[PDB]
Amino acid sequence: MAVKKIAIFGATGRTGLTTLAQAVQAGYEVTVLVRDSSRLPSEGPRPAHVVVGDVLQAADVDKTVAGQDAVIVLLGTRNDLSPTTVMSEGARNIVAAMKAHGVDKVVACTSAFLLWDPTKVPPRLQAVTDDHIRMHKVLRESGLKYVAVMPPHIGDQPLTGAYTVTLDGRGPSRVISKHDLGHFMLRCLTTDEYDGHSTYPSHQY
Numbered sequence: 645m646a647v648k649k650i651a652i653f654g655a656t657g658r659t660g661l662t663t664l665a666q667a668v669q670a671g672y673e674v675t676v677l678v679r680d681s682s683r684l685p686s687e688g689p690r691p692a693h694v695v696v697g698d699v700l701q702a703a704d705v706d707k708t709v710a711g712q713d714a715v716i717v718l719l720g721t722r723n724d725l726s727p728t729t730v731m732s733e734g735a736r737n738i739v740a741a742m743k744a745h746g747v748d749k750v751v752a753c754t755s756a757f758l759l760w761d762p763t764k765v766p767p768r769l770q771a772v773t774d775d776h777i778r779m780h781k782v783l784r785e786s787g788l789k790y791v792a793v794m795p796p797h798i799g800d801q802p803l804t805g806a807y808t809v810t811l812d813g814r815g816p817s818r819v820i821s822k823h824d825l826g827h828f829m830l831r832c833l834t835t836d837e838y839d840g841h842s843t844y845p846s847h848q849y
């Protein structure tokens with residue numbers, strides 16, 4: 645069940661690339677903000693609008709949010725586990741841009757670790773999780789219609805469209821395919837029922 649319009653942050657990442665592809669195939673008119681467009685597939689279905697810039701730069705974010713109906717956030721740091729503020733700085737700029745333009749809907753990916761007992765989060769992942777927590781707080785405090793997508797391990801299994809979604813939020817499987825995760829990000833554009841909730845998509849493959 646697919647849908648049509650939007651801006652994607654993090655479209656060049658693992659989940660971003662398939663979310664972008666699914667969004668264009670679905671019929672969405674998609675804008676992306678990318679640091680470097682050579683990381684978009686010079687092949688795959690082409691976004692309506694590519695803007696080159698940095699989510700840390702407010703004016704770049706403002707340009708990419710202008711005129712959108714909703715915002716999808718798949719920012720991340722790849723396999724870099726170092727301390728970072730990119731996601732929380734990005735979220736702050738996204739919130740400011742959404743407020744200025746009257747955009748209300750943001751679907752943003754952090755991590756299922758925000759649903760764990762904090763004493764059980766793997767220490768090596770704590771610096772990244774800290775910035776996920778910072779980003780989530782920014783989005784919660786914004787008062788915008790915010791779906792918090794908190795996935796467990798992101799796998800590479802093909803798209804099923806058959807995953808489960810648990811609200812607020814633990815969840816019985818510890819994996820979600822990147823393709824199913826992107827499918828779910830876009831599904832969240834089709835309904836208000838997850839707004840203000842945390843969501844944990846998962847599946848057994």
Ligand SMILES: NC(=O)c1ccc[n+]([C@@H]2O[C@H](COP(=O)([O-])OP(=O)(O)OC[C@H]3O[C@@H](n4cnc5c(N)ncnc54)[C@H](OP(=O)(O)O)[C@@H]3O)[C@@H](O)[C@H]2O)c1
Binds near residue numbers: 754772796
């Ligand atoms: N198992 C897992 O890996 C797992 C589990 C749970 C949650 N998560 C979280 O899920 C999210 C998505 O992960 P993923 O692996 O699909 O993403 P990823 O491969 O880490 O991609 C990160 C994306 O963010 C973009 N980005 C980074 N810094 C930026 C900046 N300053 N300005 C603009 N764009 C920037 C990257 O662009 P560039 O291409 O220019 O770098 C890329 O598009 C991440 O937050 C991750 O921590 C991951």
